Amino acid sequence: MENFQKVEKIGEGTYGVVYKARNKLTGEVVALKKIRPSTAIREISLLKELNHPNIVKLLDVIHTENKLYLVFEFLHQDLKKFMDASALTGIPLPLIKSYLFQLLQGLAFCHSHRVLHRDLKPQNLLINTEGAIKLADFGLARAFGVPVRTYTHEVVTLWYRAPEILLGCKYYSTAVDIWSLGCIFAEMVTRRALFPGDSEIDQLFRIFRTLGTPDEVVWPGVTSMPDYKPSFPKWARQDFSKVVPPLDEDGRSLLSQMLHYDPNKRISAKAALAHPFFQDVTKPVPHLRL
Numbered sequence: 001m002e003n004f005q006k007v008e009k010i011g012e013g014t015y016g017v018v019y020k021a022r023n024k025l026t027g028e029v030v031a032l033k034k035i036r037p038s039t040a041i042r043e044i045s046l047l048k049e050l051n052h053p054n055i056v057k058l059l060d061v062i063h064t065e066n067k068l069y070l071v072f073e074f075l076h077q078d079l080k081k082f083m084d085a086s087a088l089t090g091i092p093l094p095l096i097k098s099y100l101f102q103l104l105q106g107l108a109f110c111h112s113h114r115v116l117h118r119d120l121k122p123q124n125l126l127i128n129t130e131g132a133i134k135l136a137d138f139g140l141a142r143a144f145g146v147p148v149r150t151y152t153h154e155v156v157t158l159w160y161r162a163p164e165i166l167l168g169c170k171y172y173s174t175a176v177d178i179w180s181l182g183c184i185f186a187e188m189v190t191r192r193a194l195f196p197g198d199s200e201i202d203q204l205f206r207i208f209r210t211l212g213t214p215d216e217v218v219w220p221g222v223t224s225m226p227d228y229k230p231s232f233p234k235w236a237r238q239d240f241s242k243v244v245p246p247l248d249e250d251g252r253s254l255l256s257q258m259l260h261y262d263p264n265k266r267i268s269a270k271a272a273l274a275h276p277f278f279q280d281v282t283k284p285v286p287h288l289r290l
């Protein structure tokens, strides 16, 4: 793109290379995603009006020569490495809570406008020096779908996939995002992925081994789902005290609500913001290593 000078490769999205780039006239430093339909441009153009402090800002949409470029606000670090970098001591709890709190705000915004993320994961959660955290790629999945492999053949991670998606539900709702974010909260707390599955069935069986194999009692209509099988082994649900120590009772309570099997029972973002866990929420500033 004429108007942009690539600095370096910063990502290999699901959909293409992500570059750090500079605008040759405004001076702007930006994230440039190069993408590989009529629907798609119409959905993306709606994304331009979905503006929130906790949503990475979509600056521009460039369609040219059948190449498609999305120009995003740049952020200097993502959660996945911020976690990797905090391995030895973990992310302090008041920062975990600030991050969760802000992500739920971003979700309550998008969800109120009926936009789903569909593929939240530490890699597309971006942070700045200011103690803010922002959701990247919000809405591109409805626009482009979620492939099994990235454009570089990299497997798409299943670790954060909601169980209704895994069981083959076609018309899943905003609840999927709450599940994924639940998964990520647990992961910040414990410094390990909650359900690191390496196939769809491994993913599902991981979920089942932790939360109990779902049945008609906890998830009405589960047995009717497309990829549900009666031959699923039947595991018992583990207490959360065992899943996410040293997470306190408010945090363990919120977490259970975000990981309800029944998507209609699963807590919404807007209700999650009222949970007593956030009674004492603050905005700390992490130290980053720029």
Ligand SMILES: CC(C)Nc1cc(Cl)nc2c(C#N)cnn12
Binding pocket: 010, 011, 012, 013, 018, 031, 056, 072, 073, 074, 075, 076, 077, 078, 123, 126, 136, 137
């Ligand atoms: C420096 C890196 C973490 N910045 C980055 C990476 C990716 Cl994959 N996407 C980004 C957007 C968007 N959208 C903004 N900043 N990034």
